[PDB]
């Protein structure tokens, strides 16, 4: 029982339990190499 | 197997909870002696959500009743369904309530908190699984507002994962039953914001307005007003107890409706509420329920949604019905009144369907919504608080119990920021 | 090959079967109309009388 | 003999599944107990005795949907092991169904699917069902596919998924789940079919004459398509088409696999009695935008190779005249580099109708799958909805707390953006 | 002709033997009193007239467990000289059951077993049962084996012992007793099989559908393996394996003898309705980590040579196809040396069922014994548990007070390290 008791001096201050999500600065996304399936060949790159 | 533990605090909590078990007992079909005498096999599928079985065919609810004085408890047991509860779950003190928050939180709360937690420990760890707790209390009082929040902190510390759904009654704007409510509500909100997952706000005046306008009850009593609340708490958990075409339990509701950790206060409403003579005119269709739920008068909280803007909305439908008809209405109501919805969240309306409706009612609906209109209700309690606080009013009663004056300033500041937080997301 | 020729005596079973399933569907929706009207209206008739007369 | 294995994920997958197997047992002539009052080997196994067992696995993270089958009439047909149920669902959260709760049950299911593949001597592919908006459908569906890709390699993993509708929506977080799952399906799936509820919602009201449908009617319409697709492997036909032939003919490149669906005739019993519904008639109805199972009009885009499946009376003579006519139609476009553009299949067994059935017994019917650039319309709508939510960080906290690193949100943005660039580049002509 | 002697020590051994001799009596057709209403004589002696007596010796230092048999139904079957009981148990103390109290009964016991060996003209092995954690199973069992090593020499001695579970434990001093008996077992035993209660508990709940098993259910499972193991000497078969053939094939070295065991099919009646359970399926079920009766993962390490035993209408071809399929499993690791890796046996007598039983009446079954390096995982548990206790000298006073010298504690620790070295050296790359 001694551990449960909460004195008045330990009143719940704001932000103790509501954590905030950090603002997400980011790395450049690894776009086209993220997939093992090769990209389509383009229209202008046709063999003559 | 998603068991839920039920906790009742104070005069408001015990009377609401006692009527709540009358509703469930008839839905599942439990005789007041505690034995099953029902009519369908579907009732026994998932009675484990709320009940335990004593060997002998007697079912016992997972209910714990908490009070500082035993006056209201003995009034409950003398009721018809009072024999149902386990005698050892009645946990009470032997001192006056005081209608005081600090006295309930610090003086009498610490003594009873030791016994209440272990009674919770008995029911919480006796089942195969536990989804979350269920608290019923009022904010204007001293026991439910003060002792209820104390248990809420301990429940969070021991059981962080579980969903701490609470149902609260908010003090009324015109006449409210306690002088010191602005102090009690302001302190209670501080604990509710940081600890609880979901909070529902009920105002007594709306219940009076609903009964007088819609049901045409010439003399509504507190049994009938508490009957309306029992429908909503029954509606939310009905997805757990019965099969449906689209299941939506408590955790689905919290994820969809809550966009940010602190904005989770909710308003509720129930349809169909049929006037005793208007029934001969009302052909009960799916669009008919849609008209009632989004109608501003049906709302159980005295905050007008039209004065604010909606963030999220959810509707539950009970009964065998077309899935197309429900989905079309959700699109129809959203596009018709776009002025009350936020642009940067499309598809603001969540929907669900359940198979088995309440007895007699061939279909029924439940609504839960979140809006910036809650700024109306907080500005009221803040304005009353400041003028009562600017001069040292009744404060000396709380300080004599031991509460430091810095707690109020911390409490009001957190309340003030949540008002601003609703303001900024309206843009 | 283009030998749905059985239709010389095969589509007649089909169309006669089409007729019997047509009647079955209309029986099913007809009885559903009768089931709905009694349930929804006349159980409500008791709710009206009891609530009003007890009041 | 030759086998196909079915996996059903989520509420949509499961309750689609019971409708499909209700259709198949009635089609083959098997009682719900599995006994009899052929092509059984494709979908069923002989346990000994006169009893058969489906080649299916039902997976969900909550027991309500699975327990309906467990107490239902069909409970005796299924093996108790095939019905796998979790403890608590993903709450429509992709991260919860992928990282925290999904990994608690992934290895249990992977044993059971592999164990079923032992009995399938001539296995040639899988069928996998999803609902994109669901947490388990999207979250666990990604984890299942990634593991299944390395477990079996070069085996055709065919998918059939419910794309979120352009306007009808039941989940607020729905755009979040769909885009994250887009990366997983594009690399690992061999081919995945798209359908949306809203098109089925309109089709079942207009063509079929139903005033107010439920999920039950739509799941039966899906079952007809799967029956038509698999009928070539099961029963005799003038032109057989295996799973591999579909894969080669439909998709020009790896990243452009996604087809769309269509079916004809869809007609009420009292209206089907009125007309004869020849081969040319049913072929003409397939190409009207009204009949698409995905609510995107092909006329904004162009057609690549299309596959036609005929189940009924039809035999090649009138097929050639019909496709020749459809080529003359100037309301239908084709990309210049696909002059042939067609693959035709013909089977003799007519469709099977159901007690309480929504449809009549038409003596001939046709099923259609086409690859078109009109599907890019659906991706643009999903892309815009996601950016509105993510600009103000409307729901990031729920996904981050359940194990996801937020850097995966922009990565899922680029993979969809890259896919949109591929379809429009392919749509060009020289 | 050929005879086997079964010895039961402690509570665990005699309680298992109660179920075993139940199973033997029903299988051969002998009433519990020893009369009739072949291979009888490999386990029983024909006393004359028409009565039979088992070849077994029951010993425990306390009379409660034995007196249950003396008052039980089987009291008429046994010869009272065989039932040996002490006065007070070893109190789970190794020193007590080996030096102080074990000496009281050791020479009385050795006369009875030797007297039983005179009637066995063609004896070929012994069957000895232990529980490592118990004082009598370890303290007295170690003493018994040491004498039997010099008495009989190189007659093969096989053991069936219950190893302490990874997490389930009923005695605090359990780690202390196991290590001390490990020194005695490794030198004297010809080959000792491993079982543990924790894996049998999980097996008895999943495969056999039992909510809450007892020691009774687990004891019948072990009897089936021994019945399958000894069935080669009893009944006809296409491929016979003697005890010596088991001995040479399974062990490549002297200190690497410890195998693990498996059995298939273990199925309930209402599940076998859905499964044919042919040779291919039962062979596959053996190698899953779930079916191992010691809770160690074979995927964790490598396999050495395995031995397979079949009981039923099994054709030698289907055996070869099953073994060929197993070698294709890349999840199964074999050592480069021993590419052969297998010995197969076929016998015609199907398994026997028991009234009040838990198993199904399957027409064929397979028993699996394998040598693997994964058991080093189990020894790592016992080593770590011992070090924490001995670091602070948690229970040394009890053992020293009963005559035990402290110097034995590090020496027994020394051997287990050497045994742990031996397995990894062999498990290392060629
Ligand atoms: N066509 C069709 N669509 C369905 C059906 N049932 C559900 N859906 C769609 O599925 C989506 C809902 O997600 P769920 O079915 O619950 O998928 P889930 O992965 O199980 O989601 P969780 O319950 O959180 O695990 C909605 O968008 C529905 O439109 C059905 O019976 N037929
Ligand atoms: N499988 C199985 N294990 C048993 C049974 N009875 C006892 N055991 C095991 O025996 C282990 C301990 O050995 P003891 O029961 O003390 O037997 P003991 O060797 O005679 O030891 P003492 O009684 O002190 O002389 C426990 O861990 C049990 O798991 C049984 O009936 N079946
Ligand atoms: N809906 C409802 N409200 C009640 C009931 N009884 C009391 N209240 C309200 O609860 C508020 C505070 O009640 P209070 O006596 O302080 O409850 P306490 O928490 O036990 O102290 C008052 O404003 C009452 O209007 C009831 O039976 N039903
Ligand atoms: Mg699910
Ligand atoms: Mg003993």
DSSP D146-167: HHHHHHH-SSEEEEEEEPPPSS
Cα–Cα distance measured from residue E116 to residue E78, given in angstroms and rounded to the nearest whole number: 13
In angstroms, the Cα distances linking B303 to B80, B204, B307, E14 are 36, 12, 8, 77
Interval between CA E96 and ligand 2 midpoint (Å): 16
In angstroms, the Cα distances linking D287 to B72, D257, D310, D318, D366 are 72, 20, 15, 17, 12
**Ligand 1 touching residue D201 (CB < 6 A):** no
| Residue E128, token pair as written in the block | 């000895």
Residue pair D257/D192 in contact (Cβ under 8 Å)? The answer is yes
**Ligand 2 touching residue E15 (CB < 6 A):** yes
Q: Do chains E and D touch (3 or more CB pairs under 8 A)?
A: yes
In the sheet where E123-131 sits, what is the strand order? Answer: E83-85, E56-60, E3-9, E123-131, E157-162, E191-195, E260-264, E364-372, E303-312, E342-347
A14 touches chain B (CB under 8 A): yes
- The best mutation among E137, E163, E213, E399 to test binding of ligand 2, ranked by most ligand atoms within 8 Å of the C-beta, falls on E137
Residue pair D191/D250 in contact (Cβ under 8 Å)? The answer is yes
Strand-pair category, E364-372 with E260-264: antiparallel
Cα–Cα distance measured from residue D415 to residue D181, given in angstroms and rounded to the nearest whole number: 11
CA distance to partner chain A, nearest, from residue B77 (Å): 30
| Residue E89, token pair as written in the block | 């148990």
Beta bridge partners of B35: B58
Strand-pair category, E303-312 with B132-138: unpaired
Cα–Cα distance measured from residue E197 to residue D275, given in angstroms and rounded to the nearest whole number: 72
Residue pair D183/A34 in contact (Cβ under 8 Å)? The answer is yes
Cα–Cα distance measured from residue C39 to residue C32, given in angstroms and rounded to the nearest whole number: 11
Neighboring chain D residues of E275 at a CB cutoff of 8 Å: 47, 79
Q: In angstroms, what is the resolution?
A: 4.2
Burial (CB count within 10 angstroms: exposed 0-12, middle 13-18, buried 19+), residue B293 = buried
Q: Name the DSSP class of B81.
A: T
- Please state, as a whole number, how many other Cβ atoms lie within 10 Å of the Cβ of residue B400: 12
Cross-chain Cβ contact A16/B195 below 8 Å = no
Neighboring chain A residues of D426 at a CB cutoff of 8 Å: 40
E328 touches chain D (CB under 8 A): no
Give the active site residue among E62, E68, E198, E245.
E245
Technique used by the depositors: cryo-EM
Cross-chain Cβ contact A4/B402 below 8 Å = no
- Local structure of E257: helix, strand or coil: coil
Cα–Cα distance measured from residue E79 to residue E56, given in angstroms and rounded to the nearest whole number: 9
- The best mutation among E9, E10, E130 to test binding of ligand 2, ranked by most ligand atoms within 8 Å of the C-beta, falls on E10
Rounded to an integer, what is the distance from CA B98 to the centroid of its chain? 24
- Please state, as a whole number, how many other Cβ atoms lie within 10 Å of the Cβ of residue E79: 16
Burial (CB count within 10 angstroms: exposed 0-12, middle 13-18, buried 19+), residue D206 = exposed
* First CA to last CA distance, chain B: 42
| Residue E53, token pair as written in the block | 């007596």
Cα–Cα distance measured from residue B216 to residue D294, given in angstroms and rounded to the nearest whole number: 49
* Residue pointed to by tokens 């039961």: E8
| Residue B121, token pair as written in the block | 């420990």
Ligand 3, residues at Cβ distance < 6 Å? B 10-12, 15-16, 97, 99, 138, 140-144, 169, 176-178, 204, 222, 225-226
| Residue D14, token pair as written in the block | 């499961």
Ligand lying nearest the CA atom of residue E177: 2
Residue of E239, E240, E246, E236 whose CA lies nearest to E39: E236
Residue pair D3/D42 in contact (Cβ under 8 Å)? The answer is yes
Residue pair D127/D227 in contact (Cβ under 8 Å)? The answer is no
| Residue B393, token pair as written in the block | 């009013």
Neighboring chain D residues of A47 at a CB cutoff of 8 Å: none
Chains touching chain B at 3 or more Cβ pairs under 8 angstroms? Answer: A, C, D
| Residue E323, token pair as written in the block | 């073994």
**Ligand 2 touching residue E161 (CB < 6 A):** no
Cα–Cα distance measured from residue E210 to residue E390, given in angstroms and rounded to the nearest whole number: 39
Residue pair E299/E330 in contact (Cβ under 8 Å)? The answer is no
Cα–Cα distance measured from residue D24 to residue D2, given in angstroms and rounded to the nearest whole number: 16
Residue pair B404/A9 in contact (Cβ under 8 Å)? The answer is yes
| Residue E261, token pair as written in the block | 């065991």
Ligand lying nearest the CA atom of residue D221: 1
Cα–Cα distance measured from residue D251 to residue B126, given in angstroms and rounded to the nearest whole number: 56
Residue of E160, E172, E118 whose CA lies nearest to E17: E160
Cross-chain Cβ contact A4/B113 below 8 Å = yes
Strand-pair category, E303-312 with E157-162: unpaired
- Please state, as a whole number, how many other Cβ atoms lie within 10 Å of the Cβ of residue D127: 22
Residue pair B141/B188 in contact (Cβ under 8 Å)? The answer is no
Phi, psi of E102 (to 5 degrees): -60, -30
Cα–Cα distance measured from residue D242 to residue E371, given in angstroms and rounded to the nearest whole number: 45
Of E275, E280, E284, the CB nearest to D47: E275
Q: Name the DSSP class of B181.
A: H
Could you tell me which chain D residue has the CA closest to the CA of C6?
Answer: D313
B207 upstream amide cis, omega within 30 of 0? no
* Residue pointed to by tokens 């409500």: C44
Strand-pair category, D52-54 with B364-371: unpaired
Neighboring chain A residues of B261 at a CB cutoff of 8 Å: 18-19
**Ligand 2 touching residue E135 (CB < 6 A):** yes
Q: For the residues of D312-374, what is the DSSP string, one character each?
A: ES--HHHHHHHHHHHHH-TTS-B-TT-SS-EEEEEE-SPP---TT-SS---SEEEEEEEEEGG
Residue pair E208/E199 in contact (Cβ under 8 Å)? The answer is no
Residue of B195, B177, B184, B182 whose CA lies nearest to B143: B184
Ligand lying nearest the CA atom of residue D204: 1
Chains touching chain D at 3 or more Cβ pairs under 8 angstroms? Answer: A, B, C, E
| Chain B, chain C: beta-carbon pairs less than 8 Å apart | 14
Cα–Cα distance measured from residue D30 to residue D37, given in angstroms and rounded to the nearest whole number: 7
In angstroms, the Cα distances linking D216 to D220, D225, D260, E108 are 7, 15, 21, 78
Interval between CA B102 and ligand 4 midpoint (Å): 45
- Please state, as a whole number, how many other Cβ atoms lie within 10 Å of the Cβ of residue D381: 15
Residue of D124, D157, D132 whose CA lies nearest to D42: D124
Residue pair B133/B2 in contact (Cβ under 8 Å)? The answer is no
Residue pair D148/D57 in contact (Cβ under 8 Å)? The answer is no
Residue pair D166/D381 in contact (Cβ under 8 Å)? The answer is yes
Q: For the residues of chain C, what is the DSSP string, one character each?
A: ----GGGGTSHHHHHHHHHHHHHHHHHHHHHHHHHHHIIIIIHHHHHHHHHHHH-
Cα–Cα distance measured from residue E410 to residue B226, given in angstroms and rounded to the nearest whole number: 74
Residue pair E140/E9 in contact (Cβ under 8 Å)? The answer is yes
Cross-chain Cβ contact A35/D406 below 8 Å = no
Neighboring chain B residues of A17 at a CB cutoff of 8 Å: 156, 194-195
* Residue pointed to by tokens 């006519």: D325
Length of chain E: 430
Q: For the residues of E185-235, what is the DSSP string, one character each?
A: HHHH-SEEEEE-HHHHHHHHHHTS--SS--HHHHHHHHHHHHHHHHHHHHS
Phi, psi of D175 (to 5 degrees): -60, -30
DSSP H or E run through B12: helix B10-28
Beta bridge partners of E48: E51
């Amino acid at each position: 029982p001694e551990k449960l008791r909460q004195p008045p001096s330990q009143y719940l201050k704001k932000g103790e339990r509501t954590k905030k999500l950090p603002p997400k600065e980011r790395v450049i996304p690894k776009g086209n190499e993220g997939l093992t399936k090769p990209p389509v060949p383009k229209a202008t790159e046709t063999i003559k | 197997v998603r068991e839920i533990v039920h906790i009742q605090a104070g005069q408001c909590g015990n009377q609401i909870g006692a009527k709540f078990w009358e509703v469930i007992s008839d839905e599942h079909g439990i005789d007041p002696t505690g034995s099953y005498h029902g009519d369908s096999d579907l009732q026994l599928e998932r009675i484990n959500v709320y009940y335990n079985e004593a060997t002998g065919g007697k079912y016992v609810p997972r209910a714990i009743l908490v009070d500082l004085e035993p006056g209201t408890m003995d009034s409950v047991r003398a009721g018809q369904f009072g024999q149902l509860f386990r005698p050892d779950n009645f946990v009470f003190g032997q001192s006056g309530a005081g209608n005081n928050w600090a006295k309930g939180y610090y003086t009498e709360g610490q003594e009873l908190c030791e016994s209440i937690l272990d009674v919770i420990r008995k029911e919480a760890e006796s089942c195969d699984c536990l989804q979350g707790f269920q608290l019923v209390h009022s904010l204007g009082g001293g026991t439910g507002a003060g002792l209820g929040t104390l248990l809420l902190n301990k429940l969070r510390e021991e059981y962080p994962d579980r969903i701490l759904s609470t149902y609260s009654i908010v003090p009324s704007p015109k006449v409210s039953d306690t002088v010191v409510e602005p102090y009690n509500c302001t302190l209670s909100v501080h604990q509710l914001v940081e600890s609880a997952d979901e909070v529902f706000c009920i105002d007594n005046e709306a219940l009076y307005d609903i009964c007088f306008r819609t049901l045409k009850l010439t003399t509504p009593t507190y049994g009938d007003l508490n009957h309306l609340v029992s429908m909503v708490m029954s509606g939310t958990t009905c997805a757990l107890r019965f099969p449906g075409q689209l299941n939506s339990d408590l955790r689905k509701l919290a994820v969809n409706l809550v966009p940010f950790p602190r904005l989770h206060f909710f308003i509720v409403g129930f349809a169909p509420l049929t006037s005793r003579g208007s029934q001969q005119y009302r052909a009960l269709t799916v669009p008919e329920l849609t008209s009632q739920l989004f109608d501003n008068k049906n709302m159980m909280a005295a905050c007008d949604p039209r004065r604010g803007v909606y963030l999220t909305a959810s509707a539950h439908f009970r009964g065998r019905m077309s899935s197309k008809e429900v989905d079309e209405q959700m699109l129809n109501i959203q596009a018709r009144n776009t002025s009350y919805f936020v642009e940067w969240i499309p598809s603001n309306v969540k929907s669900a369907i359940c198979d088995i409706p309440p007895r007699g009612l061939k279909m029924a609906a439940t609504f839960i919504g979140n809006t910036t209109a809650f700024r109306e209700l907080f500005t009221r309690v803040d304005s009353q608080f400041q003028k009562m606080y600017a001069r040292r009013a009744f404060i000396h009663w709380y300080v004599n119990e031991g509460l430091e004056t810095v707690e109020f300033d911390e409490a009001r500041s957190n309340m003030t920021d949540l008002i601003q937080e609703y303001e900024m997301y309206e843009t | 090959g283009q030998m749905d020729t059985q239709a010389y005596k095969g589509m007649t079973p089909e169309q006669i079967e089409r007729l019997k399933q047509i009647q079955l569907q209309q029986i099913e929706e007809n009885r559903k109309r009768r089931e709905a009207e009694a349930e929804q209206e006349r159980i409500d008739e008791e709710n009206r009388k009891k609530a009003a007369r007890d009041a | 003999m030759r086998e196909v294995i079915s996996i059903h994920v989520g509420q949509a997958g499961v309750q689609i599944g019971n409708g499909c197997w209700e259709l198949y047992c009635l089609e083959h002539g098997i009682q719900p107990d599995g006994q009899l009052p052929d092509a059984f080997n494709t979908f069923f196994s002989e346990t000994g005795a006169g009893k058969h067992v489906p080649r299916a696995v039902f997976v969900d993270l909550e027991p309500t949907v699975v327990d309906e089958v467990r107490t239902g009439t069909y409970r005796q047909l299924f093996h108790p092991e095939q019905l796998i149920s979790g403890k608590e669902d993903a709450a429509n959260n992709y991260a919860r169904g992928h990282y925290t709760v999904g990994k608690e049950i992934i290895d249990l299911t992977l044993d059971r699917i592999r164990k079923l593949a032992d009995q399938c001597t001539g296995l040639q592919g899988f069928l996998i069902f999803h609902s994109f908006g669901g947490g388990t459908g999207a979250g666990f569906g990604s984890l299942l596919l990634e593991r299944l890709s390395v477990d079996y390699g070069k085996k055709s993993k065919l998918e059939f998924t419910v794309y979120p509708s352009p306007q009808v929506s039941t989940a607020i977080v729905e755009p979040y789940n769909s885009i994250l799952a887009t990366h997983s399906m594009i690399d690992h799936s061999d081919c995945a079919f798209m359908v949306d509820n809203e098109a089925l919602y309109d089709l079942c009201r207009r063509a079929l004459d139903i005033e107010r449908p439920t999920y039950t009617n739509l799941n039966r319409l899906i079952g007809q398509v799967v029956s038509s697709l698999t009928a070539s492997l099961r029963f005799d036909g003038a032109l057989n088409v295996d799973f591999t032939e579909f894969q080669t003919n439909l998709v020009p490149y790896a990243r452009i696999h996604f087809p769309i669906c269509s079916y004809a005739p869809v007609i009420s019993a009292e209206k089907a009695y009125h007309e004869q519904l020849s081969v040319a008639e049913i072929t003409n109805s397939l190409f009207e935008p009204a009949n698409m199972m995905v609510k995107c009009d092909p006329r904004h885009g162009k057609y690549m190779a299309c596959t036609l499946l005929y189940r009924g009376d039809v035999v090649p003579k009138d097929v050639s005249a019909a496709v020749a006519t459809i080529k003359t139609k100037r309301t239908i476009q084709f990309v210049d580099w696909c002059p042939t553009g067609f693959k035709m299949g013909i089977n003799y067994q007519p469709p099977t109708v159901v007690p309480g059935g929504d449809l009549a017994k038409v003596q001939r019917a046709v099923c259609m799958l086409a690859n078109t650039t009109a599907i890019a319309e659906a991706w643009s709508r999903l892309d815009h909805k996601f950016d509105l939510m993510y600009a103000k960080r409307a729901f990031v906290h729920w996904y981050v707390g359940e194990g996801m690193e937020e850097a995966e949100f922009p990565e899922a943005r680029e993979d969809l953006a890259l896919l949109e660039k591929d379809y429009d580049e392919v749509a060009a002509e020289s």
